Design a protein around this ligand. Structure first.
Ligand SMILES: O=c1ccn([C@H]2C[C@H](O)[C@@H](COP(=O)(O)OP(=O)(O)O)O2)c(=O)[nH]1
Lengths: 370, 373
């Protein structure tokens, strides 16, 4: 059996899209082990095995410890990701030494991954969460910022191999800026993984009754973001459709009673939901976006520029459109459900995604590389 | 279009678990997997997969159980029993199949709702057994008969289109089974342990030159005054130059009473992960435990039930990978035998090699996609 060590960022959304691959390898009769922290339990809930490389560590404190200030760039974030990776290094190394992998899989911001691969002279595989996760020269910079961590464990090497995986289909890829394109990367089909579930009664869709998923995302929902959707839900009663709202932690009490045609659930796997849905309104999460694409379903994105890159994609491909929360209502919903061009394009991209090699295939490719 | 696979399984944990690799494999190929079961259903969810509860609220214990002169003290009794248990899944299985529209039904041998559903919708079905034990002759054919009333009600007059039988049993083990328990023409699939996912503990990585023996009674059998069995063993293990790892699986710890220093206790830990770091295993004769141990290429000691005459003794003996031992007479002697007897290890290793030559679940999944597609 080949042995694959998955060294990931502690965050749920970085972990989840690695599961298909891990799962795929186990399916080939090989061995998979994770080496992470934070939202590690998600690995266990996926039928896989994980080692906690940073027990007790408070990540929040770690992440967070200008007119004139320099270094308002990638360097700030590289530094930040280095501090977070730092607390995984020792753990990752002990595990790698005892468990002895043939291959390191890592996520782009997890600096412990290439460090470990370099230390043990193994190849590494970069597995990104999606299009957003393609910050230019991020990896090289994280490495630099971790110099002190490399030098302490006596690591002068570069890992053996450096494969980059991509789950982004070619047409989406084309619409990204040149410096965010990853050419020569191994394409792998995006296979939604959102968690396993005992599915509810109501999931199977009623006869001739259309359905719109509304998702806040696992993150922005707890900020106080449910408020955002108040205008929407003040007009949905007028819409000849069923709405499914996933809270993902958000406070219901912020708006309270919703119309009869709105169903509320805390969590449900997105892939499973969209299988039965006609359209989706969301926040612009990468995982949510790719999942929706995969489902071949029109999309509406409530943008928000605290920082997105997802406007030009939906527009460019013609699978969807953007809409400000304050001006979001029945009309957008109608457009989602009736606009033929949105559906065909959605379907078009889905087809493209299904032509990309599945994770099973990608796994076979790696097994030999190791 | 993804191919769609409906997994209709027995409500029991141990029947569910060995189906995961396959399901998992299909997802990996970019296809769709959905389970349709009850009872220990939440294990499906914890495996990263999706499930429909076909029998919510149902009390299974009441279902399973409500000499010299009675009659039919045979397979017919168990067929009838399995029919009653399957019965409560039928309606659910059918609704799901109708709405979800699978291309392929995957079932476990005692789950009668599986072939019923495959027959009703004229789909092929795939039998996936838990291991060698799960090969009662003509069990399926008899469950069907006992479920006649269930078939006739949903107006099912026909047979599923296809009937593929999977086997995770390696050829050498297969040869040592009685003829009527052999499944020839069955598609071989590599046994890939699946026991559940875990956040693995500190101590799992094994110390330098320190040998380790796993002791386990399983997910069941350790319950309700069954841990007592191992009291003689733990009264002698202190003498053994090795580390012992005991998995409680619900058993009352206090019953063993006093433990030596060289014994570590954990409630639960995935068996595959444990045995990777172990030199040998003492167990109860669990079918998933046995194949896992084989896969680990590891000598085995088995504790028999006095209630039923399993076939496991002859396999272990026949292959020379292990031996049997009564709980009352189980001690340091056997442990030493496990760790030092060269023949046990080589044989164990030999069978492991054989298992690794069988097609993995990924390959088997591909084969099915063609069968249904
Ligand atoms: O601590 C434990 C206890 C049980 N198991 C798993 C191993 C095995 O795959 C399953 C049960 O084994 P079985 O003998 O097939 O089932 P039963 O208990 O029904 O005999 O539970 C573990 O992984 N760790």
């Amino acid at each position: 059996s080949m042995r694959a060590l998955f060294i990931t960022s502690p965050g749920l959304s970085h972990i989840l899209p690695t599961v298909p691959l891990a799962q795929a390898l186990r399916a080939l009769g090989h061995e998979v082990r994770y080496a992470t922290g934070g939202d590690i339990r998600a690995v266990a809930e996926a039928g896989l095995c994980a080692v906690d490389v940073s027990p007790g560590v408070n990540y929040a404190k770690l992440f967070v410890p200008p007119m004139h200030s320099e270094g308002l760039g990638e360097g700030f974030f590289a530094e930040m990701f280095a501090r977070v990776s730092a607390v995984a290094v020792d753990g990752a190394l002990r595990t790698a030494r005892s468990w002895r992998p043939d291959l390191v899989v890592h996520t782009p911001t997890q600096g412990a991954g290439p460090l470990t691969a370099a230390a043990l002279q193994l190849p590494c595989v970069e597995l990104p969460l999606g299009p957003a996760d393609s910050e230019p020269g991020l990896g090289a910079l994280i490495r630099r910022a971790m110099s002190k961590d490399y030098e302490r464990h006596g690591v002068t090497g570069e890992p053996t191999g450096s494969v980059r995986l991509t789950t982004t289909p070619p047409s989406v890829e084309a619409l990204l800026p040149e410096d965010r394109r990853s050419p020569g990367a191994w394409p792998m089909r995006y296979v939604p993984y959102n968690g396993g579930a005992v599915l509810p009664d109501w999931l199977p869709p009623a006869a001739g009754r259309r359905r719109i998923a509304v998702t806040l995302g696992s993150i922005d929902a707890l900020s106080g973001g449910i408020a955002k959707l108040a205008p929407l839900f003040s007009e949905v009663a007028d819409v000849d459709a069923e709405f499914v709202l996933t809270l993902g932690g958000g406070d219901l009490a912020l708006l309270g009673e919703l119309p009869a045609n709105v169903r509320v659930v805390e969590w449900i796997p997105l892939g499973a939901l969209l299988e039965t849905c006609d359209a989706i309104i969301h926040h612009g999460g990468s995982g949510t976006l790719l999942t929706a694409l995969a489902a071949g379903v029109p999309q509406c994105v409530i943008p928000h520029g605290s920082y997105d890159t997802n406007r030009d994609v939906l527009t460019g491909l013609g699978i969807g459109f953007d809409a400000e929360a304050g001006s979001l209502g029945a009309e957008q919903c109608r457009r989602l459900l009736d606009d033929a061009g949105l559906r065909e394009a959605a379907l078009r991209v889905r087809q493209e995604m299904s032509e990309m090699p599945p994770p099973a295939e990608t796994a076979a490719k790696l097994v030999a590389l190791a």
